[PDB]
């Protein structure tokens, strides 16, 4: 009945049962909690169970603006005609904006520190306070909209609140799309999967279904294998910022206080820029900070992210590994040896077989994160297919895609082509030394870092009326 406390498997509960010799939970009468995702059609004996997307599938920066009209309205600064996003009124980060707080019933951020009394931040997406690094990116973007709605006001002083906001929102939305498709995706997929799945943009196609597919919500969780066991903070010299420069992850979840009180977003961004991501390896898939101690502080038990991903795929009725390989036009291994060949690793193949019995039953996330990485990419062929296919749909099927005719003028697009994540950091933080492009490859200081002086800024001259 109550999923956060009981081990009873009764709708909507689907608790993750505990196996023999568990390295953390000795009582097999216990469970890792799990609420099944809301059905699209509640209680139907007819239609096949599907889940809902609370968000716009488009790369439209809805994480900044909201996907529901009342939220979007509330995230805005309605005190004037400046078309700004609401900023925290109680706090600042070296005279710079922080996200405003949210008024939650049971607030998990307050639970991370009684003394501090720092609640969850309000943003377009509700998971903004999940970790201070994600919170830094949400804050980075809340500042870019306000900075653009200030440059546009000084350029077009006859413009009102709605115009400035809509025009700034549009630029942020395009920055998100550029970084993703020009910088992010090629490094996820690799060059070959990039040509195959994302050939050069032609134009908007109204027959391309832009919806997020159920499988993608699981396949895109490949990133859980890139997670580092600590949150790293570095000063202006890119040297550890003591005390607590490497704070374990299981102590940072919902720790919005660490942003407000422990130094703001700058020590966090420098950390993201100058720290290498974890590398996914067959015998080094995902860290115990997420596999054992996920939300440890705020729950009755530590959650297991890899296991939650596998329970979620079963709850979402997702076919197994081989059905997805077939869908991708990839050979489906039937035997242990055949899985060995696909995996380039017979030891992992033997283990997967012991667990699943057949490569037909291997859960999507599990079989996807197990495949050897494509050259210059961070996924194997199956995830590259699912990831690539989904992104082409969000691109080819977006009427408001930055390159679509009528969205931005040829002049506005030549100006937008100049954008970068290192520059957005420069323009909205006290950070003076940023990553050399590509920001996603650059992980070593001072070898991969350069000054803000060298970097071209975005020119809004083509936005003058």
């Amino acid at each position: 009945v109550n999923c956060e406390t009981s081990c009873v498997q009764q709708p909507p509960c689907f608790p993750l049962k505990i196996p023999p010799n568990d390295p953390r939970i000795k009582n097999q009468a216990d469970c890792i909690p799990f609420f099944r995702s809301c059905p699209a059609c509640p209680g139907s004996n007819i239609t096949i169970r599907n889940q809902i997307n609370a968000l716009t599938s488009f790369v439209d920066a809805s994480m900044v603006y909201g996907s529901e009209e009342p939220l979007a309205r509330n995230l805005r600064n309605m005190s004037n005609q400046l078309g700004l996003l609401a900023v925290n009124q109680r706090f600042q980060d070296n005279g710079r904006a922080l996200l405003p707080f949210d008024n939650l019933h049971d607030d998990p951020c307050l639970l991370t520190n009684r003394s501090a009394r720092i609640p969850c931040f309000l943003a377009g997406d509700t998971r903004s306070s999940e970790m201070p690094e994600l919170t830094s990116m949400h804050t980075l973007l809340l500042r870019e909209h306000n900075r653009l709605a200030t440059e546009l006001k000084s350029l077009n002083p006859r413009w009102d609140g709605e115009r400035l906001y809509q025009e700034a929102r549009k630029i942020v939305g395009a920055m998100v799309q550029i970084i993703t498709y020009r910088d992010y995706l090629p490094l996820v997929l690799g060059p070959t999967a990039m040509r195959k799945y994302l050939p050069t943009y032609r134009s908007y196609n109204d027959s391309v279904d832009p919806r997020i597919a159920n499988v993608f919500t699981n396949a895109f969780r490949y990133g859980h294998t890139l997670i580092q066991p600590f949150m790293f903070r570095l000063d202006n010299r890119y040297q550890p910022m003591e005390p607590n420069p490497r704070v374990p992850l299981s102590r940072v979840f919902f720790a919005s206080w660490r942003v407000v009180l422990e130094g703001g977003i700058d020590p966090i961004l420098r950390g993201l820029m100058a720290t290498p991501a974890k590398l996914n390896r067959q015998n080094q898939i995902a860290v115990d900070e997420i596999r054992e101690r996920l939300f440890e502080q705020v729950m009755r038990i530590g959650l297991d992210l890899p296991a939650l991903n596998m329970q979620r795929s079963r709850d979402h009725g997702l076919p197994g590994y081989n059905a997805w390989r077939r869908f991708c036009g990839l050979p489906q291994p039937e035997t242990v040896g055949q899985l060995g060949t696909v995996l380039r690793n017979l030891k992992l193949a033997r283990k997967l077989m012991e667990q699943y019995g057949t490569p037909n039953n291997i859960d999507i996330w599990m079989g996807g994160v197990s495949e050897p990485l494509k050259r210059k990419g961070r996924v194997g062929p199956l995830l590259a297919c699912i990831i690539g296919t989904q992104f082409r749909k969000l691109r080819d099927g977006d009427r408001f895609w930055w390159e679509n005719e009528g969205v931005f003028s040829m002049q506005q697009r030549q100006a937008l082509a100049q954008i970068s994540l290192p520059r957005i950091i420069c323009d909205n933080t006290g950070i003076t030394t940023v990553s050399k492009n590509n920001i996603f490859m650059s992980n070593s200081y001072p070898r991969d870092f350069v000054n803000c002086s060298t970097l071209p800024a975005l020119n809004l001259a083509s936005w003058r009326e």
Partner: protein, 103 residues
């Protein structure tokens, strides 16, 4: 649907003029493959003990995690080719595309 718009709706409604809910918030996901449920329509594999999938028993997600995923923190390999910003962009990006609500 408004005949002529300059900006997106917050909701994503009207982006596709023929099927205006497409890509819009608070709608069902699209399926690329038919759902595979124990009963065929709603119950997840592993919901019922002894109920097999393709003639093989259903592994516990926690057990697959213990056997396949579990590794000692000390062994961690830092990626010489990627920043933690690469991980972080992935999550922020994911948060622009999908959120599956629960009760």
């Amino acid at each position: 649907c408004p005949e002529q718009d300059k900006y997106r709706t917050i909701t994503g409604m009207c982006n596709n003029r023929r099927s205006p809910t497409l890509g819009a918030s608070n709608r069902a996901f699209v399926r690329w493959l038919p759902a595979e449920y124990e009963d065929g329509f709603s119950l997840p594999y592993g919901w019922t003990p002894g109920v097999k999938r393709n003639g093989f028993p259903v592994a516990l997600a926690r057990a697959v995690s213990n056997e396949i995923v579990r590794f000692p923190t000390d062994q961690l390999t830092p990626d010489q080719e990627r920043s933690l910003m690469f991980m972080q962009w992935g999550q922020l990006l994911d948060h622009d595309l999908d959120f599956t609500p629960e009760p």
